[PDB]
Design a protein around this ligand. Structure first.
Ligand SMILES: OC[C@H]1O[C@@H](O)[C@H](O)[C@@H](O)[C@@H]1O
Ligand SMILES: [Mg+2]
Length: 535
């Protein structure tokens, strides 16, 4: 079963906010270990762990100072081995983050690199002389504010950083650095990890000519990976990322993965044309296994929009393979971002049904299975530095990083002390304990939907074909071998009706969904889904 990843569902855990088992108010590995039974009960195929490596935590894990160890705040390496072993014992695959695009400035490589222009690791990072006027070498901007270049007095040069100043980008034009990062991945592969989520996978290479980016002409759409309030979105990003050379490196990376059968990779795409880039990076079977984009991580969410996304993707390379996600640690929770103007109890069910019925892999964010709304984090409680640069137009990512509601008790049973982010009040009555034995609650809807998905080959990796189901409905067929299923979704809060584009063999009941099939006319109540066998 070495193709488990091609259609499998992965449960993303944000370590800081899952479960605190030691008592410092911050989630740790042992808590995850304690809740692997819960995770397994979701009928998901595996997990993706956000960074838990040694880090100053200035970007909370994504500024890595030691690629081959666990930060004391999350526990130890042995703790991780225990977590991995128990997870394997439950039939769960374990994937972990890899942030090889950039390191913390506290990483030994950079500490050495910054001292002078001639040291062994001087070229392991991206250094450039200032312009004659002492200004940055080009117009590249940091996503987290300011120029992408920061001056260092030691070398009298600027160093590049797409994100924080404390996150210098690695110079992938230096083969030994590439190799060092590959080795860093190999370290974790040798420990038995089942795969990697590749942080900003298209960022790896930059234009060595350091050419200026062109601006986006007024009225054209901005990039999906950043809020429009961010000046980052004022230029087309062609030279600061997504270079051709990266393809070659991807092959190398894939080669490493090939040395360990059954392992996989999912790339995070941050690009002006995310679908196209995902196709490019996941094509050939010699590069990325799969990748996800921000197309379903933004504001549009109509059935017509989904149709546009699916159509657009189907026009790309057919050998490509997508991973779909409606929520993660970087965006507003799906129940709020998409379903703010919808029923808070009904909409997450049909949304997640759509997510689970799309052709591709799935990323399911912690709490999304509870239909958790975006939390309101007060100014004085803000932790994410990305929330302190564009306030209040953009308030950062803390809203989706609030602690997991296990019980409706004190601090949601997350911690015996005050957690690093405040527990959201509204989450308490949506807690796991309050929701576990409720068959009408979103959790069990998710369980049933994923078991249902698991019982049908067509919903694993079957082909997808859009069909006419009306303007206010989303409809398509999934086909593999004997089995052809018709999937119809009502994402609206109003009853909808359509003529069936194919012939139904039998109705398929799943997760207490209600739909009326009268001959050739199908009716769907508000926020309902319909699955059917096709003759
Ligand atoms: O590390 C810089 C940023 O890169 C993004 O791709 C990650 O998903 C974020 O969590 C992180 O803050
Ligand atoms: Mg702890």
């Amino acid at each position: 079963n070495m193709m488990w990843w091609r259609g499998g569902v992965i449960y993303q855990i944000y370590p800081r906010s899952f479960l605190d088992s030691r008592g410092d108010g911050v989630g740790d590995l042992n808590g995850i270990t304690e809740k692997l039974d819960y995770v397994a009960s979701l009928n998901v195929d595996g997990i993706w762990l956000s960074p838990f490596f040694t880090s100053p935590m200035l970007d909370f894990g994504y500024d890595v100072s030691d690629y081959r160890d666990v930060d004391p705040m999350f526990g130890t390496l042995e703790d991780f081995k225990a977590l991995l072993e128990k997870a394997h014992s439950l039939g769960l695959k374990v994937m972990i983050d890899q942030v090889i695009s950039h390191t913390s400035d506290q990483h030994p490589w950079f500490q050495e690199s910054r001292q002078n222009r001639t040291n062994p690791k001087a070229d392991w990072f991206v250094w450039a002389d200032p312009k004659p006027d002492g200004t940055p070498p080009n117009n590249w901007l940091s996503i987290f504010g300011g120029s992408a270049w920061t001056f260092d007095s030691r070398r009298q040069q600027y160093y590049l950083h797409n994100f924080l100043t404390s996150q210098p980008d690695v110079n992938f034009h230096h083969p030994e650095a590439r190799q060092a990062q590959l080795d860093n991945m190999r370290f974790w592969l040798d420990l038995g990890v089942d795969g990697f989520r590749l942080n900003t996978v298209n960022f790896y290479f930059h234009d060595a000519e350091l050419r200026d980016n062109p601006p986006v002409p007024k009225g054209e759409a901005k990039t999906l990976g950043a809020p429009e309030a961010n000046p980052y979105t004022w230029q087309r990003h062609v030279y600061d990322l997504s270079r051709p050379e990266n393809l070659d490196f991807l092959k190398d990376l894939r080669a490493l993965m090939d040395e360990y059968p059954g392992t996989t990779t999912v790339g995070e795409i941050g690009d002006d044309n995310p679908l196209e880039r995902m196709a490019e990076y996941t094509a050939g079977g010699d590069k990325l296994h799969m990748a996800y984009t921000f197309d379903l991580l933004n504001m549009p969410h109509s059935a017509s929009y989904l149709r546009e996304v699916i159509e657009r993707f189907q026009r790309l390379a057919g050998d490509a393979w997508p991973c779909w996600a409606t929520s993660n640690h970087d965006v507003v929770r799906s129940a709020t971002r998409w379903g703010a103007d919808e029923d808070p109890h009904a909409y997450p069910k049909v949304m997640l049904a759509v997510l689970f019925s799309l052709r591709g892999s799935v990323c399911l964010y912690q709490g999304e299975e509870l239909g958790l709304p975006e939390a309101d984090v007060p100014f004085e409680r803000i932790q994410d530095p990305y929330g302190k640069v564009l306030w209040p137009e953009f308030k950062g990512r803390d809203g989706c990083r609030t602690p997991m509601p296990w019980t409706d008790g004190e601090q949601g049973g997350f911690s015996p002390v005050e957690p690093w982010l405040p527990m959201e009040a509204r989450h308490l009555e949506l807690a796991v304990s309050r929701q576990q034995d409720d068959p009408n609650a979103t959790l069990n809807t998710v369980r049933a939907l994923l078991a249902f998905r698991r019982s049908h080959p067509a919903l694993f990796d079957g082909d997808l074909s859009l069909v006419d189901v009306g303007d206010d409905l989303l409809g398509f067929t999934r086909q593999k071998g004997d089995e052809t299923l018709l999937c119809v979704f009502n994402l609206t809060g109003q009853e909808q009706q359509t003529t069936l584009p194919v012939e139904v063999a039998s109705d398929l009941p799943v997760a207490h969904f209600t739909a009326t099939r009268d001959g050739s006319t199908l009716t769907l109540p508000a926020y309902q889904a319909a699955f059917m066998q096709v003759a």
